């Protein structure tokens, strides 16, 4: 068999605004979740409200 052609457009994908925002939102939400836990941990340890 012939080696796979890298330029074959059938093996290429186009990331539109949808997928582009999805990964961006996923990263930002992950940071938001981490911040939420840090506040929870800080409140318990420092004895705040």
């Amino acid at each position: 068999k012939d080696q796979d052609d890298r330029d074959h457009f059938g093996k290429k994908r186009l990331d539109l605004a949808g997928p582009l925002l999805a990964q961006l939102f996923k990263t930002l939400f992950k940071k938001l979740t981490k911040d939420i836990f840090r506040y929870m941990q800080r409140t318990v340890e420092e004895a705040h409200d």
């Binding site: 836990f37 941990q41 318990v44 340890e45």
Partner: peptide, 9 residues
């Protein structure tokens, strides 16, 4: 002792 604070996945 322990850290008195941990997260469970």
């Amino acid at each position: 002792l322990r850290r008195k604070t941990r997260q469970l996945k």
